Amino acid sequence: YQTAPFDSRFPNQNQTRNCWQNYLDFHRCEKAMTAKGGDVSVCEWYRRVYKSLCPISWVSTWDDRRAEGTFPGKI
Amino acid sequence: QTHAYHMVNPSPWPLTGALSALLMTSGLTMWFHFNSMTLLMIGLTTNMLTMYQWWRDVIRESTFQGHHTPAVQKGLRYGMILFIISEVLFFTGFFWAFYHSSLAPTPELGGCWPPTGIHPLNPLEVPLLNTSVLLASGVSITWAHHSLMEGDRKHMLQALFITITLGVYFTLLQASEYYEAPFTISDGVYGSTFFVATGFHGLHVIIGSTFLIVCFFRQLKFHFTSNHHFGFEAAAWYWHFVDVVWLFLYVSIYWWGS
Amino acid sequence: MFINRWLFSTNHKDIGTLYLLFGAWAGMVGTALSLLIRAELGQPGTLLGDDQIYNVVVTAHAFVMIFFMVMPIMIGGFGNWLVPLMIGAPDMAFPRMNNMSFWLLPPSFLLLLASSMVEAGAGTGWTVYPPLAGNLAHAGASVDLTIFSLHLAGVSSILGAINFITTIINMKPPAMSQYQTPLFVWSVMITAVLLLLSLPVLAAGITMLLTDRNLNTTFFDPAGGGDPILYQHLFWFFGHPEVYILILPGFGMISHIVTYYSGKKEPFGYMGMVWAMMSIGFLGFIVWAHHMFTVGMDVDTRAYFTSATMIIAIPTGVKVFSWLATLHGGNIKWSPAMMWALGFIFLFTVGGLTGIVLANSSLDIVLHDTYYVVAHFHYVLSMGAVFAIMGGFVHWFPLFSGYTLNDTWAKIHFAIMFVGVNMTFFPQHFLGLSGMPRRYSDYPDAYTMWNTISSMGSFISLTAVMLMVFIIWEAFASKREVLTVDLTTTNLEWLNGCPPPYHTFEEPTYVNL
Amino acid sequence: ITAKPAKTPTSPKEQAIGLSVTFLSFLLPAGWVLYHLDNY
Amino acid sequence: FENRVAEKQKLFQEDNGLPVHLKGGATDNILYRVTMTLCLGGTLYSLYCLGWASFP
Amino acid sequence: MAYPMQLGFQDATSPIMEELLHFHDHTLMIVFLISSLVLYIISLMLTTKLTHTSTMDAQEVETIWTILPAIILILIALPSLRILYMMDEINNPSLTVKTMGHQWYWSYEYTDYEDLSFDSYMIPTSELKPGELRLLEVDNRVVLPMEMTIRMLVSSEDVLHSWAVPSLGLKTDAIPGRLNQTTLMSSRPGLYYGQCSEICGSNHSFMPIVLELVPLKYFEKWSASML
Amino acid sequence: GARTWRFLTFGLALPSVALCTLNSWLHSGHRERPAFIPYHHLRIRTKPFSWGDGNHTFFHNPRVNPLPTGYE
Amino acid sequence: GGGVPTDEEQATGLEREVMLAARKGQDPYNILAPKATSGTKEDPNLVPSITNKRIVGCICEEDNSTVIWFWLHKGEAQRCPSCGTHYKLVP
Amino acid sequence: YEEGPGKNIPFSVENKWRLLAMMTLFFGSGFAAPFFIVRHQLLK
Ligand code: HEA
Ligand code: HEA
Ligand SMILES: CCCCC/C=C/C/C=C/C/C=C/C/C=C\CCCC(=O)O[C@H](COC(=O)CCCCCCCCCCCCCCCCC)COP(=O)(O)OCCN
Ligand SMILES: CCCCCC/C=C/CCCCCCCCCC(=O)O[C@H](COC(=O)CCCCCCCCCCCCCCC)COP(=O)(O)OC[C@@H](O)CO
Ligand SMILES: CCCCCC/C=C\CCCCCCCCCC(=O)O[C@H](COC(=O)CCCCCCCCCCCCCCC)COP(=O)(O)OC[C@@H](O)CO
Ligand SMILES: CCCCCCCCCCO[C@@H]1O[C@H](CO)[C@@H](O[C@H]2O[C@H](CO)[C@@H](O)[C@H](O)[C@H]2O)[C@H](O)[C@H]1O
Ligand SMILES: CCCCCCCCCCO[C@@H]1O[C@H](CO)[C@@H](O[C@H]2O[C@H](CO)[C@@H](O)[C@H](O)[C@H]2O)[C@H](O)[C@H]1O
Ligand SMILES: CCCCCCCCCCO[C@@H]1O[C@H](CO)[C@@H](O[C@H]2O[C@H](CO)[C@@H](O)[C@H](O)[C@H]2O)[C@H](O)[C@H]1O
Ligand SMILES: C[C@H](CCC(=O)O)[C@H]1CC[C@H]2[C@@H]3[C@H](O)C[C@@H]4C[C@H](O)CC[C@]4(C)[C@H]3C[C@H](O)[C@]12C
Ligand code: CUA
Ligand SMILES: [Xe]
Ligand SMILES: [Zn+2]
């Protein structure tokens, strides 16, 4: 892993949804693996991609909203 | 003159209207920023005085003085159509804002439409009733038009009264809707698009209803002939415009956007 | 009698005179703002010591020149004076509504000068983009007063558009088809259609900005799901038609001036000139996103906007070549108005061609938000509009006033102005190519030489403006009353004398089929 | 264009006065503000 | 109601030199003065407000 | 960076800026030629005592006046659009860097592996080291590997800004709530300068961009030292 | 003619309004309000409103419109 | 049911004058385009006027975009300076 | 209303020197205004 590869779902200059989708994907997968006592290494691809693409302040705001119960995406 | 056009007497109403615009805008500024409604209420008063006296004079010039030859009437027809076109393009801007927001919902909304936490109105309840009301009022205003062309005073007044009653019913239903809505103008872009688009539409319904009421009183005073009644035609065109904007709002915001 | 005539007017000529006076006054304001801009940039470092005030000066400069100088002069002034005369009509369709289009402009201007005097002004650019124009980065009344100034100007021009379209469609002689109306009348009709369709979209967008600033809407605020780029689309959907609004009446005046001073009865290729203006008007609605090539839109969208934008060169070239073919074989009269019109054709062509450079999205990445854009529009808009206005002013001044100008003084004025504008704007191309951003109060040291020259140019144009006022004074001071003009057989606006009586065409023209 | 002789001809001297007053009306107020920018 | 348009046509066509905004009689004069006083006074008040708002 | 008395573009540092230089040369030749032809024909129309003032037939000449411009526009559009599609063309970046605009400075995030981030402020004129450039120097430069495809993601934490580096052919608006992507590839080491290119208030003139392009080994040493 | 348009008014248009009125009146009961969640994209306050305490929307309904801090 | 006034009953001022003149096939307010004669010296176009001169616009050939404007004076017929068509003023 | 040269304007051209005063005040006020607004903002 060097950086997030080209993703044909997000081929344009606006990459907002690429960051968002990988953040959701990581947290949905982390919930599925924890809720069984499973293994979060399965979620690693999504973690590396969102960490690469997403502004630190977006990740930090989303994290705070998940802990507050105000995150508006479905996890 | 040996042309058929109207040389208008020098008039103060353009200047009083221009100053009413200054007072309403400086008044909104002084309400939003300086905690005061004074200028705004003066501007609203001078705006209503200006519109009353200007359109009174147009009635004096036409019904009482005979200045509306066929050539003048043709100009007024073009003027009202061009005015309605400018109002269509105004609404187009709000529809553009609605489709921009709803077709590409941002992550702050939950990346979905309607946004997370928004409970839209059921479009089959009061919004469907509002649709039947304005469509019915388009039928009754057409009955009024035909009664007037056929020389039938009683049925013109009955049809126009029914049209106005339906306009008022829409306005009271929308007022009630506004109060019962569990979302507000501050509920993000969903509230913003809903209240600004339907709010400008409700303003046009009140304007349209007011125009129909002017036509009702002019008809009671025998101003219209079976052949010459442009104020009635203009109010009917404006009323159909208000109906058609509603149908677009209903399909776009209430139904497709729910 | 004075208040009845000048405050309660229902006369197209008097209202045209009010618009010309208003526009000339606004031009002094806009010129003063332009000289403050070039004084700040005239040497490296800070002059005003306040970059918020610099940004307010730049913003006001543009609003004054567009909304209070060009549109009032071209449409309110020449339009109201000439359109009824050129179609033999006794006035405008809505002579009282016409007076309200005029009287909305002083209040509009007052709201703009209030924006600049309260808080720290609206230092937004004339585009007023959020979030800079929002209630956090521009807290206070300044931006709201700018929005209201635009509302009043917007209502003035929408009602004026309704009046011109109705007048031109409904008030010609019954034998005169639309294909027997003069090109200036076509240019006003088409401008009025663009105003009618574009200003309501601007009104929707700045109303959304008002509600985001004051009613807790979020049309342009990502926190509520809004999008700053939506404002840009609404603004430029108006803004591109607006630049064609600013030049089209100038195209009409240039057609009349070139025809007149070539000693011709008619412009070359009349139906081609009508086609070209209608084509430019139509295409002007489908190109707006060339103002947005750096905001992150899709490559195919950039390809479309590049291609559509370049198409406008075709009808535009037909007009340029048609003006040249009107000169062809003329008995040329080297009047000052002809000099303005020839200056127009050349300077408009240069600016139009830098437009075609900018149309290329790829190159636009490097030229966007640089002085190359500033150079482009000061050629095509600033010099185009101004040269067309000065040509129209010196041509029709004797019609409006009954008095002649001193032609030698008017030629001196032209010569000074031609030197000044070229010395001011030509070097801005170099500044843009070499990467100097627009909307800057100061610049890296490398950009000093061309900024210095540009600022020296701005003072030469000031000398021309001061001379222009003197020349107008000398004409009213000397009172050389017009007797005759040539070519009245193809210039109906002259046929009632100079100035024409308060009421003209009480008895309409006789035109048979 | 043809015109009657000037009803009230403006001599070279009258033009120098007109030009001078015009230029001063532009230059003096702006000059006063720009000269005092330090004091501001 | 009764059709009294002919009586209003006679009033508004009387050869008395009045402009149409005043031809109805003394009530027109009163409404005009109220309108123009509120407009001019309101405009003077808006300038005062500008003077106030122009300083901290 | 620009130099005194410069007329044209900064020397190209990237292959796409090279393509833009060659495309501008082609287009400028056409601008010159058309400008010159219009001025020439004006002088030609104005320099003869010969006259023809009767009605002229326009139909034949208007074919020439529409077809020749249409051909010229196609000859500009073909290479313009080839370059447009080249700067969109899928590439595999080896590095992603974020930049966030602020009133009035840039921050940079290198979060491919480490959480590295820092702010980048204009050096005031009173603090410039001898020989440093007024309005262009920053305290913390954007360290990047040369000869490698880099993905830059641009956004804002407040108002609009625009992240520009003329010598690389780059300009991408910085919009809050939006992540705009561009590709960066430097053919050379060195320092490459740019300036905020969307009006963002009083200090718009004073929040520059400085890239520092170094061989990959030195980029990796710099990254490692940052832990 | 007028006779036809009156026929449509009374025979189709007003009967439609009567049926939609019945539909509306039958579904008019108060819905149970949802749990309050202080979502950051809702109850926006960038400037106080220019009426009341600055925190109430113009047609605020206590039963169904929570404030930023929740139901009154 | 009646009760709506007709134009015949209630039109007034210039509207009524236009209405009454159209019933008689007259056009005192210049609503209609006049039909040209052959325009020869024997058959000139007859230009009504309430005064001793009136502006004539001559569309010399159908579909000409250029209209030729001139004052036509009381007295001997005048000719369009572009096509030579004759016009005679009839006060 | 009065008709003819110098009579179709809201300002008098009866006296060229009074005209020069009025034109000077008219265009001079417009040109001065931005200098005095800048001064006003700087003195804040
Ligand atoms: C009078 C006003 C006016 C006119 C008429 C135009 C005309 C054109 N403009 Fe310009 N423009 C502005 C005023 C105007 N513009 C303003 C004010 C801005 C900046 C707004 C802001 O950001 O503040 C601007 C900005 C602007 C941009 C955005 C640049 C950026 O911000 O990065 C672009 C992009 O495509 C554009 C292109 C054009 C084109 C292609 C034309 C065409 O219509 C030109 C067509 C004319 C010709 C081409 C010349 C004549 C033709 C011939 C002689 C025939 C032969 C020619 C060829 C074969 C090429 N202009
Ligand atoms: C019609 C529009 C127009 C006109 C005429 C002008 C005229 C001038 N402009 Fe510009 N300008 C703009 C429109 C115009 N401008 C716009 C839209 C912007 C962008 C704002 C933004 O970024 O948001 C701009 C920005 C702009 C900038 C860039 C600021 C920056 O990016 O920081 C500069 C820099 O030099 C400039 C300079 C000038 C100068 C020196 C003049 C003049 O001094 C040139 C000489 C012309 C005159 C002196 C006019 C004379 C006319 C009259 C006085 C009327 C007479 C009336 C009658 C005869 C009836 N203007
Ligand atoms: C019943 C049917 C219709 C009712 C009409 C509305 C009544 C009051 C206002 C009148 C003006 C309406 C026009 C549209 C403007 C803005 C918003 C109006 C829509 C409305 O009334 O929305 C209300 C908010 O009003 C608000 O903020 C307060 C709004 C009051 C101040 C508005 C000021 C804005 C004026 C803008 C002027 C621009 C004009 C454009 C000119 C263009 C020219 C080119 C919604 O209530 P809420 O509590 O949030 O949610 C309901 C919760 N139970
Ligand atoms: C409670 C109120 C609060 C809200 C306030 C806002 C304003 C509300 C106003 C409603 C509009 C009332 C208009 C009344 C016009 C009456 C004059 C009229 O109707 O005039 C007629 C001409 O029409 C004409 O000018 C046609 C004139 C058409 C006017 C068009 C009106 C639409 C105006 C909209 C206002 C702006 C909306 C924009 C909002 C952003 C006269 O000709 P006839 O009818 O042929 O008569 C002659 C015959 O009798 C002869 O036999
Ligand atoms: C933020 C707050 C800012 C808002 C400020 C609003 C601005 C100004 C205050 C408005 C004051 C209006 C007073 C009444 C104006 C009535 C105009 C009218 O009705 O004009 C008529 C013509 O326009 C016609 O018909 C058809 C056109 C009728 C137009 C009615 C006026 C509407 C004004 C607002 C419209 C904006 C449009 C919305 C789209 C963006 C009549 O023309 P006249 O020349 O009078 O007479 C001709 C004679 O032959 C008649 O016998
Ligand atoms: C001949 C013409 C007659 C002119 C008379 C003008 C009419 C009103 C004059 C008094 O001015 C008012 O005074 C109130 C204070 O004394 C203000 O309260 C305002 O401030 C309150 C704050 O307590 C808020 O509730 C409201 O914005 C508002 O009432 C109110 O806004 C403002 O209009
Ligand atoms: C962008 C357009 C600007 C173009 C520049 C105009 C050209 C200069 C015009 C003259 O302006 C004046 O200059 C004087 C200086 O020459 C100033 O006197 C100032 O300086 C004098 C001498 O130093 C003192 O005696 C005075 O008291 C003092 O006010 C005076 O105020 C100012 O009106
Ligand atoms: C006939 C032509 C028109 C004539 C115009 C007449 C103008 C009337 C002047 C009234 O002045 C008012 O004074 C109030 C008290 O001084 C202000 O109250 C407001 O400001 C107060 C400051 O004490 C606050 O308590 C509140 O926001 C509010 O009461 C209010 O803004 C202002 O309008
Ligand atoms: C009695 C009177 C006659 C009208 C006349 O010829 O002057 C009639 C004719 C039409 C009547 C109106 C229409 O029937 C419609 C309405 C019917 C409602 O029941 C009363 C109000 C209402 C608005 C009526 C008022 C009044 O009774 C009117 C105006
Ligand atoms: Cu940041 Cu301009
Ligand atoms: Xe507007
Ligand atoms: Zn003829």
Numbering used by the authors:
A (entry chain U): 11 to 85
B (entry chain P): 4 to 261
C (entry chain N): 1 to 513
D (entry chain Z): 1 to 40
E (entry chain W): 1 to 56
F (entry chain O): 1 to 227
G (entry chain T): 12 to 83
H (entry chain S): 3 to 93
Lines quoted from the article behind this entry:
pmcCytochrome c oxidase (CcO), a terminal enzyme of the respiratory chain, catalyzes oxygen (O2) reduction coupled with the proton pump, generating a proton-motive force across the membrane. Mammalian CcO consists of three mitochondrial DNA–coded core subunits (subunits I, II, and III) and at least 10 nuclear DNA–coded peripheral subunits.
(1) Fully reduced CcO was treated with Xe under an anaerobic environment. Using these crystals, we measured the X-ray diffraction data at 1.8 Å resolution. In the analysis of the anomalous difference maps, clear anomalous peaks were observed at eight sites in CcO in the fully reduced states. Xe5 was in the cavity formed by the transmembrane helices (helices X, XI, and XII) of subunit I at about 8 Å from the matrix side surface. In the reduced CcO, Xe6 was in the cavity formed by the redox-dependent structural change of heme a side chain (hydroxyfarnesylethyl group) and the transmembrane helices (helices X and XI) of subunit I. The anomalous peak of Xe6 was much lower than that of Xe5. Xe7 was in the cavity formed by the terminus of the heme a3 side chain and the transmembrane helices (helix IX of subunit I and helices I and II of subunit II) at about 8 Å from the transmembrane surface.
